[PDB]
DNA sequence: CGCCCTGGAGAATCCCGGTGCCGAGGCCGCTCAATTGGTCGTAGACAGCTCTAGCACCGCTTAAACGCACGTACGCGCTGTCCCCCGCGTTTTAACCGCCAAGGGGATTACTCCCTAGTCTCCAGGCACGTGTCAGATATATACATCCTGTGCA
């Protein structure tokens, strides 16, 4: 049985992950 | 026959060491605008005096506010639908280094004249102010103009 999260679960942990990071989210060369 | 509650499972997180790494701060060399004093002349606070619109008020004169009665219709709650983007696995590209080394032009620092304007000065004139005059809005004679009344008639 594969292990899959229900839709909407990863969004919360992504909010927790990125809201704790001050790094820039855009690469240097494209900008 | 199919749904809350429980239990097993899995993985994401927290927290505590454990060692390599680098710039915060200290230390020095140095060096330049702050500090101290003197000079000088100048606007700001103190009256001084004045004058003028804000203040508090009183009383017509309407005019919005309000209370309510009806009402109807859209905000809302509920339900069924379906479709679209998240989660995940597989494909595809962007970027780093290795090779293999050279210059290049543009802001920086230093030097160097040179001439436009601050400062002072006097001469003039021009727009804020007072007054003339017409435009528009106002209030009133007026020549009829519509009921009312004597009034004479058939």
Swiss-Prot record:
Residues with the N6-methyllysine modification: 1
Function, as annotated: Core component of nucleosome. Nucleosomes wrap and compact DNA into chromatin, limiting DNA accessibility to the cellular machineries which require DNA as a template. Histones thereby play a central role in transcription regulation, DNA repair, DNA replication and chromosomal stability. DNA accessibility is regulated via a complex set of post-translational modifications of histones, also called histone code, and nucleosome remodeling.
Oligomeric and partner information: The nucleosome is a histone octamer containing two molecules each of H2A, H2B, H3 and H4 assembled in one H3-H4 heterotetramer and two H2A-H2B heterodimers. The octamer wraps approximately 147 bp of DNA. Histone H3 is a component of the UAF (upstream activation factor) complex, which consists of UAF30, RRN5, RRN9, RRN10, and histones H3 and H4.
Family statement: Belongs to the histone H3 family.
UniProt modification remark: Phosphorylated by IPL1 to form H3S10ph in a cell cycle-dependent manner during mitosis and meiosis. H3S10ph is also formed by SNF1, promotes subsequent H3K14ac formation by GCN5, and is required for transcriptional activation through TBP recruitment to the promoters. Dephosphorylation is performed by GLC7.
Domain of life (superkingdom): Eukaryota
Additional observations: Present with 213000 molecules/cell in log phase SD medium.
Sequence positions bearing N6-malonyllysine: 20
Residue span relative to the full protein: 38 to 68 of 136
Subcellular location: Nucleus; Chromosome
Name the UniProt record assigns to this protein: Histone H3
PTM annotation (N6-propionyllysine): residues: 20
Residues annotated with N6-acetyllysine modification: 1, 20, 28
């Amino acid at each position: 049985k594969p292990h899959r999260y229900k839709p909407g679960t990863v969004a919360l942990r992504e909010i927790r992950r990125f809201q704790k990071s001050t790094e820039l989210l855009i690469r240097k060369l494209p900008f």
